[PDB]
Design a protein around this ligand. Structure first.
Ligand SMILES: *[C@@H]1O[C@H](CO)[C@@H](O[C@@H]2O[C@H](CO)[C@@H](O[C@@H]3O[C@H](CO)[C@@H](O)[C@H](O)[C@@H]3O)[C@H](O)[C@H]2NC(C)=O)[C@H](O)[C@H]1NC(C)=O
Lengths: 54, 174
């Protein structure tokens, strides 16, 4: 496949929300990009994203 | 519809009158006039205040509304989203403009009705001794001072006090 930013490989990114309690297991034999930090989320609704230059 | 008073049988307004919307102008033995009618103008202020507050409180405020994002294989849903936003915007702008346009004729006719009723009251409590002359003026065959002026204003005229004496002067002019 053609080069982008001088690289011919590609990489895919994934995400998952755990719950409280429940576990998760990674199991790999060739290509893992392991997580190294993660995030614990609060609540409080009605936010968003704004594109502005003010 | 148009009740016929404002810019009708009564000519233009009075700049010299300040403290109200509807009032009188009297010329007895010792002065000129421009006194307001605090009874009717208070009812007009109450009606208009309630009207504006009602129009404000029918419209709910909106909460957070932020745009969404779609990739190149979700064109169909993206067009649906745009259709929903444009439809609701058209409906609300229609409602706003139409509400203001109808409310304006309602309020102007309301003022016109108030002026006509305020004229009819004064005519009705001066049945014989007045001789109305044009654009809402009267002319007292008998003699009047400040007390009978206030007596007209409040709505307590007691016509049979003067009913004979006026009659004499009327038969003088006829
Ligand atoms: C509407 O107007 C009438 C006037 O026709 C008001 O009644 C009047 O009240 C005034 C108060 O200043 C009276 O004037 C004074 O009364 C005192 C007390 O008797 C007297 O000592 C003074 O010499 C002077 O007369 C006025 O006489 C009285 N009306 C009469 C019969 O002349 C009335 O209060 C006003 N309000 C309403 C809603 O009627």
């Amino acid at each position: 496949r053609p080069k982008v930013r001088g690289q011919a490989g590609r990489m895919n990114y994934y995400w998952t929300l755990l719950d409280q309690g429940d576990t998760i297991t990674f199991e790999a034999t060739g290509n893992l990009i392991a997580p190294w930090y993660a995030f614990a989320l609060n609540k409080g609704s009605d936010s968003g994203i704004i594109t502005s230059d003010a | 519809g148009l009740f016929g008073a404002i810019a009708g049988f009564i000519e233009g307004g009075w700049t010299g009158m300040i403290d109200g919307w509807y009032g009188y102008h009297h010329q007895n033995e010792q002065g000129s006039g421009y006194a307001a009618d605090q009874k009717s103008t208070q009812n007009a202020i109450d009606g208009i205040t309630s009207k504006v507050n009602s129009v404000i409180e029918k419209m709910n405020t909106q909460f957070t509304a932020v745009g969404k994002e779609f990739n190149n294989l979700e064109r169909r849903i993206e067009n649906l989203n745009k259709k929903v936003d444009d439809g609701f915007l058209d409906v609300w702008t229609y409602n706003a403009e139409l509400l203001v346009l109808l409310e304006n004729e309602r309020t102007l006719d309301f003022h016109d009705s108030n002026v006509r009723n305020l004229y009819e009251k004064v005519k009705s409590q001066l049945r014989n001794n007045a001789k109305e002359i044009g654009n809402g003026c009267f002319e007292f065959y008998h003699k009047c001072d400040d007390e009978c002026m206030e007596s007209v204003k409040n709505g307590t005229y007691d016509y049979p006090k003067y009913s004979e004496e006026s009659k004499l002067n009327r038969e003088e002019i006829d």
